[PDB]
Amino acid sequence: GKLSLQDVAELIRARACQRVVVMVGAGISTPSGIPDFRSPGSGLYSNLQQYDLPYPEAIFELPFFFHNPKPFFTLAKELYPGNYKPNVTHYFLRLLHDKGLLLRLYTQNIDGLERVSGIPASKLVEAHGTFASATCTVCQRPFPGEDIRADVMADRVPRCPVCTGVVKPDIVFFGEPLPQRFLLHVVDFPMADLLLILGTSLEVEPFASLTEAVRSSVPRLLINRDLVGPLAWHPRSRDVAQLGDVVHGVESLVELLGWTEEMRDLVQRETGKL
Amino acid sequence: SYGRKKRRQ
Ligand SMILES: [Zn+2]
């Protein structure tokens, strides 16, 4: 009848599942120490309070951004490459890639930790964009993310050296389309033979609707604190919910797969390089 | 690119 976590691990161990697509959100990166910009308590939260944000998500809305770009660049400074390391969840996905199982990893996060963990760019869809590149909001000139880093770290809003427009990192804001690579979902999701969903509430579209794009025979494993989204209201017969702390669900799956010592070796060697 | 980025609520 209903599949267990051990069942999914055995499908992988028996090579019944070969082509895994992964969807992840902010829950996989809280163990790295990244503070939720919405939650009272952190220095990030306190620094955002000095501004006229009517509500936290205005940090990703263009009307607010053009009125006052400083809250967004306060978040950019916090999240810019180097301050945070990937954690066990990212390295599980990296080991999954190294073991030849990763068809594609779709992420909603903008912390860049998937690529830092060493997953190749070709295997990643950074569906909500990236700080790796930036674009002038007026003249549309592109820039390497490194080119605005000095300004961002000095608390200066980066300006375009040709037209003086605000230069905006290529983060997808509410109301904007997702990146071109998002369209890989048209060929990836029919090819997948297992879907993993980690650390997300599935509250943002069109990302969340991807859960419905796998074939009906394909198991969907959710590792998350709560049952969520299209899995809560359109349950399918091969769905599996591993409810609880994301890192502990990942550790349990890693042990069932037979990967624990290998994962610890990978994590030691990688976090050491950083 | 399946729609614009949007909050489900
Ligand atoms: Zn410009």
Author numbering:
A (entry chain A): 121 to 394
B (entry chain B): 46 to 54
Sentences reproduced from the published study:
Sirtuins are NAD+-dependent protein lysine deacylases implicated in metabolic regulation and aging-related dysfunctions. Sirt1 features the conserved sirtuin catalytic core of ~270 residues, which comprises a Rossman-fold domain and a smaller Zn2+-binding module. A cleft between these subdomains accommodates NAD+ and recognizes the acylated substrate polypeptide with low sequence selectivity, and binding of these substrates is accompanied by Sirt1 closure movements. Tat binds to the sirtuin catalytic core and inhibits Sirt1, Sirt2, and Sirt3 with comparable potencies.
To analyze why Tat inhibits sirtuins instead of serving as a regular substrate, we solved the crystal structure of a Sirt3/ac-Tat-46–54 complex at 1.65 Å resolution and refined it to Rcryst/Rfree values of 18.1/20.9%. Residues 46–54 of the Tat substrate peptide are inserted in the substrate binding groove in the typical, β-sheet-like fashion observed in a previous Sirt1/ac-p53 peptide complex and other sirtuin/substrate complexes. The acetylated Tat Lys50 interacts with Sirt3 Val292, Phe293/294, and the catalytic His248, and comparable interactions would be formed with Sirt1. In addition, Tat residues in the range of (−3) to (+3) relative to Lys50 interact, similarly, with Sirt3 (and likely Sirt1) in the complexes with acetylated and non-acetylated Tat, respectively. Small differences in this range concern sidechain conformation, which does not affect directed interactions. Larger differences are seen for more remote residues, Ser46 at the N-terminus, and Gln54 at the C-terminus and indicate a different chain orientation from there on. In particular, the binding mode of the more C-terminal Tat residues comprising the basic region, which seems to be key in inhibitory Tat binding, could be influenced electrostatically by Lys50 acetylation, which removes a positive charge. Using ac-Tat-46–54 as a substrate revealed efficient Sirt1-dependent deacetylation, even slightly more efficient than for its standard substrate peptide ac-p53-Lys382. Our data, indeed, indicate that Tat binds in a slightly different conformation compared to a substrate and that Tat serving as a substrate has to dissociate before it can bind in the inhibitory mode.
